[model samples]
Target: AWPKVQPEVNIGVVGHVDHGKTTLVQAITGIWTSKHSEELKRGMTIKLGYAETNIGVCESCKKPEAYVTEPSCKSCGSDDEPKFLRRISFIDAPGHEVLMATMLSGAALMDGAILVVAANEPFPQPQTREHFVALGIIGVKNLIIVQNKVDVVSKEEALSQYRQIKQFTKGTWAENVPIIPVSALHKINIDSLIEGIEEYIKTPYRDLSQKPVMLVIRSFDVNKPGTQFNELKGGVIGGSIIQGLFKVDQEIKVLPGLRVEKQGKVSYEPIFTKISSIRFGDEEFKEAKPGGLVAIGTYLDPSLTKADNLLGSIITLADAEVPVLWNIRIKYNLLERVVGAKEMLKVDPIRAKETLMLSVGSSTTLGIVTSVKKDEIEVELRRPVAVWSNNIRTVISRQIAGRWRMIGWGLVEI
Candidate 1:
């Protein structure tokens, strides 16, 4: 039996729209990733969805046949109990063509990723390539490719799709990554995918001594309407920690916390509050380390966090030095062909006075081009952000075909 209840790592389910990313997650974790009414209504995901569960194995079987999610082994049923490997959290990223920004935000929290491709459709779908590039940009090292939806395709067609995946990933970061055939709809060969993940993506080493830092992907109000005022809970923020440890009752700093508009000008003020509670899934923890997704209860008004009001904020120790900046100088590189577009149009150089969307450390906003250089440029942001390091990756996107298309990536200059 496992001694700790805390999840030890975060893995992401990423792919093109309608590729069964969410379905694959449900098959593995037995938890529906999407819960929002908006997502249910559209039969798609718009925001990042999270679920946590254990990955275990059957001692009596071999390799792919040994992995199991239930207490009894599916292959041999040798023992009623399975061997626990690790507790992991899954981030179901939106796969639609337009939500690249949200995927990039979710990428910040991913330690590893499983790229799902529907075998019924052509491989290398628009978002499939785009998401692959995003994983590279975000430095998510461990990856496993799942050729999903095999139940709808013939064995020969599945083989053809497998070859397509291999050819596209050749010489790239995923050139040698393992590709497993799966049927999320029917839960076929899911044990093999779990086996692949268990062998390929190990829990990463962490430094618990560094200063605590967390990226806020989601914030919410848990209070029920019409509840007694005195019994209302505080605002809650959920995200993955990058380094160090977090504890209850410790003072935390939330940067770019609140937006203030005065005399047609906007400014962000930081919020400082004590950690009222710390939780992983439903279990409470006195302290949290640098792994898994955690929700922190703060002593702020519930109104401040409802409907993602505090999304894209950074959390750290109160005394940590943070720089709030309105302008940034960036060194950037553009892809040869634009992603998410069917035409794959050639990328153009950065032009002066053009408004571009910039995402850094989960926070995304517009930055009007201020100065253009050969390979570097400067831009002033419409929304201010709190800086963590001297260099943070900035994803640049422009409006193309009535949608935001990611064209390049940049590094922010301190």
Candidate 2:
């Protein structure tokens, strides 16, 4: 599932919902990101339509603010905003979960993260705590804090605000990170901030020689009820390519596709279908190579693809089918203290046969531990999932202080 926009990088614009919010992305994409309360609340985390932002830099007018979101750079009156630097996906998501679960799932496709914090706001807001931990605990490789609402605050106040954020990251990797102060409301000094990611989160090159892979994060049948047979659209699945490339008319395989329950028995029914179309929002693509949020049309029965089905399946080429696992062995580590909770208690050792909910991005299932060996454990899965070549990280959770909460993360070995 290559992204429709096929961007070079997918960066998550995350923070408390109220933190100068959409103005930044609004400044970048110029399209107010569509938000649905239902979708945000439906799962631990969700990725909305990826808006590919076109950035222009006025190099001739030497300075960082010289970069503009194209109503032309203020330095030069002429609208010759010619340097088309990038088509970055300003991906939007809710630090949506049992706080940690929200971070884990959002981390799935997040190549880099932009920490947007409201400058006028004070320390340790509940929302900021959750969003901050999600990025730090889940181990996102690159993150930069953008202090927003700087325009509304006095220099001293904003400086203290920066220290507040700095105090929070004291011992963390973010201590060395950049804290880009921006007035998203007024679109001030965002260009230098944009260039920061260029050096920090350089778009890791894709390996096209490897088999093209996809992980289904969303799926639904878009047609209305009682539609005519002639103009019917097939089921559409939303995801982004993991590696390699995919083209329209390509044949794809879905592992653990349609689940079938027999007389007191259950098994997966694999499905193979032809790709009818590749779309990113309204734009259609003949070929796709990993990037933003994408919707792919398939010639499969919509009934099988709708609402309750198709989420968490692996998509790959017909000749190179990824293995479906009913059980897996993982090398995992438990956080010293359980976050996502006010209690912050130390994590107890997981016992053999203990049942914990395990997740891989958007996929969640029960893991009844088969055995525990130090950081290594074998667990049986309640549902099967397609395993890709890239090692999958499984977020582990169980009843913590009696509520199902995210505790630690693990690595799956095929």
Candidate 3:
């Protein structure tokens, strides 16, 4: 595991659904993080796409409302409107996961957080509160609050809503935090928002001199085989490096994929190779450093596997201990009969197979609920991994008969 230190600020965007989270990212970075083809066709963000938005409204008072520098309406303006504004990287996440394990993956290792709440919605939402709770549990102290969509509410109504938000954070770190009001669609206060980020989140600097460890979030092979042996045969995993420098030809092996390649070895795996290449801005660098986005090179073809696993370093090994909880309720995403009892957990290595693929997380595992009660659950995991109390994971119930699978994720607790 990497040592806990604030090398660079990584902020997460979170809040109630449609609270302008995706819009806020676009308003700041200008690169639409939402890339779902369907979302583009529908004219707005539908689910999760880590798009970076760059353009923001003009900040100077001299700029008239009509002259404000803003992102032109995609529906109205040509596709050429500038979208990127700053060096900050934004991870746009989904709000409606039956279980929000994806959000957890995004939250882990973040240096700070952005809590987006709706001003006109009238009150704080369950996910809004849950996100805050998760951040607090992880010991995150720095945050920014975006009271989005003020244009949707009256000034009086917005202020009243802001007051309600204050009430919601009575004893929390978000208490007394600054909240900027903006409308992503109308582009109001977008500049002030950018200035706020600059004043708070510092500039990003990638140190290509430290030990590199890039965690894979999403991956895919770009080219098909049977045609070119050199067909784009690798996948892209998105994660920040905590240490070391990554150079072209430097040896690397993606987890789960590597594990599947080797048929499952709990022991650490390492490869000695060079960076086949590195790319940024249509340019290639021999090396890249820690604390910023990184993609790696794989040999003998990668991406013919699952998007699971974390990177291991020469001085580090992947840890799989899970938090033990006294109180837990298991919800299977795709199982049929109520999964419960002593049979629920992959307590033995032999049962590890049935649950390994479904289990995921750097410090987490995927599992199924063989049995459940009000306060306790006996789970069968895809693999044998450790868990600590207050840690979170999602369960995917297996399909049985003719029923749709149920998916839900939550924290294990005492």
Candidate 4:
């Protein structure tokens, strides 16, 4: 039998930086995915972060935790941890507008999203509003508002912020969304937050029975060189299986492509590589199920392969979709918009602009807008960038004068 999707929900975390995205996911992971060397030095998030869970119970229903039969767990805090909910993966997105496109690409792959907002903030920052808007553009019907930092604000103040949020989101998809106040730093309302997510996320109707296809997001060589014959070479491919199931020793096609040409002038060698097998948890599953973040072994040189590739059942699509765009129409609330060139876009900074630096789950890029309109925008990036589907999602800067500041993000459908 095909391996079933252990749980039924996949969620994406989004909002402006310093708003508690990585910290929230870390609270759940019990590991700080945000604690990079530089982050430890500068105190900021480095890239997209992820954590997974196998909730023993059904995600859509309030089935007793004991009733879950598939991904059985011992207890909430047990060494043989009981699955509190079926299955869910959390993606912590950057908060800058420049990284908004990356955030959109990540949003495209998720079934739902959790919009984290700092309770102390006066209102939803530009990027916060943008993430919510982008989710709507992607047709994401399930959403939960995270009113974080409750410990910092008084109950009255938190309630004021909640009412403010309700006013801010009026007439939009999040008009009547559920808001769970939390203090990730203090471990306040963590259980309530998780329980709310498990309750609200719409459960997937089909699982192992579905056709398998993993949109490979992040790929790299694993460190443990489990002797591949006489040579020392091995790597793991990490990504969420969009559909179907994949297994160990099963021959699957990785992304096949060359560098994109500009004005139909450039042609580069096609980059191709393959994995020998796959592993999940402790044991090596001859095959992995859909919606799993798997680590696969590769025979190719690690230095040759890059992130942003896919692995799974044969892909029959025409041209592979790139999830990056250049010209983006962004709504920025600034004192004045400074018009400037694209070179001003900075990658590494002390307090990186969260909205602009939004890294797609498994992709990365820097872009500039070639043209703009009220609701539609066009971006011309330096190289071929990864975008989610068409123009369903986007993140852009609010830099008026060469300096990237107060990032703004949103999405447009083509």
Best by lDDT: 1
Q: Tell me the lDDT of model 1 at 83.
A: 89
lDDT of 1 at 77: 51
TM-score of each: 0.90, 0.89, 0.61, 0.63
Cα lDDT tens digits, model 4, 1-414, are 113343335687775675377778767555454543533332122265555555454343442333233343343333343434355666665434244334545544677778888899877766575456556544566788998898998999999999989897788767888898888787777766766776777665556754445655555543334656566565456556655666555544443334556888853333344546665433355666655445566655665443323321122122334323333333322222221243223322212223343223333345555454554445544444333343334344443355433344455443
Report lDDT (CA) for all predictions. 0.79, 0.72, 0.47, 0.53
What is candidate 1's CA lDDT for residue 288? Answer: 81
Total clashing pairs for each candidate: 0, 2, 65, 50
Please report how far candidate 4 places residue 65 from its true position, in Å. 12
Residue 230 accuracy (lDDT) in model 3: 47
Tens-place lDDT digits, model 2, residues 292-394: 6667889988887787377778678877867778899888888677554555577888888999888875577776899898888888999987777646888
Predicted structure 4, TM vs. truth = 0.63
lDDT tens digits, residues 1-414, model 1? Answer: 654678888888876664367777878888767663433332122365677778778887787778766566756757557788778888775445345677777556777888888889877876677778777766678999998889888999999989989998898988888999998888889878888888788888887887788888778787768999889998888777777899999998888778888889877778888899888876788998766777789998988888778888889899999887888899988777765445667778888999999888879989899999978999989888777877777888888777787787888888
> Which residue segments of model 1 deviate by more than 4 Å?
36-46, 71-77, 94-98, 262-265, 339-342
RMSD of each: 3.3, 4.0, 10.5, 8.6
Error of 4 at 311 (Å): 12
